């Protein structure tokens, strides 16, 4: 068997670091004993556990960074979206929909009407 992400989600940073250190030590010991046996499948399991622990730690760090950057604009680029280079620029919806006073007055005075031509 192996560790589960949801189980680690309920552990503090220090506990996650200790678990990561223990798993790394176990992986190193297994690697030192790799030639002792023809094949030990537990190496893959411990590697997957280490990867999951690292992912959980990175997620916690990123959530903390987001929390400490809450509210203020111009947040670090990494936390921003990754749509594409072209879509980031070019008149975001509010700027695109902006209308001058004259055009707004003309639209309000003479808005497009719905009608039918039989009677």
């Amino acid at each position: 068997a192996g560790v589960k992400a949801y189980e680690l989600r309920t552990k503090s940073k220090e506990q996650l670091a200790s678990q990561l250190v223990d798993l790394k030590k176990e992986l190193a010991e297994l690697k030192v004993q790799k030639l002792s046996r023809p094949s030990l499948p537990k190496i893959k399991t411990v590697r997957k556990s280490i990867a999951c622990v690292l992912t959980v730690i990175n997620e916690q760090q990123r959530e903390a960074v987001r929390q400490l950057y809450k509210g203020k604009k111009y947040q670090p680029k990494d936390l921003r979206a990754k749509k594409t280079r072209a879509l980031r620029r070019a008149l975001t919806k509010f700027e695109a929909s902006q209308v001058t006073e004259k055009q707004r007055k003309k639209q309000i005075a003479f808005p497009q009407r719905k009608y039918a031509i039989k009677a």
Binding site: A81, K82, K83, T84
Partner: protein, 71 residues
């Protein structure tokens, strides 16, 4: 006569001229000409790995959605 090129490693880096006769290194623009259709094909996008360009089409199909599922 020639050495491996850092940009492409084609072994076409002229020591005397300190430039690559294939990709044009260290020129800013990668060397390529219309008459060299075979040369263009040999270096056309897709021959390599396309680490980021591969998933662009898949991401667009989802509208560049951001977040996570709701279960």
């Amino acid at each position: 006569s020639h050495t491996l090129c850092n940009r492409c490693g084609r072994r076409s880096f002229h020591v005397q001229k300190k430039t690559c006769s294939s990709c044009g290194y260290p020129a800013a623009k990668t060397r390529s000409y219309n008459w060299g259709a075979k040369a263009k094909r040999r270096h056309t996008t897709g021959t390599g790995r396309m680490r980021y360009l591969k998933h662009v089409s898949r991401r667009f199909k989802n509208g560049f959605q951001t977040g996570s599922a709701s279960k």
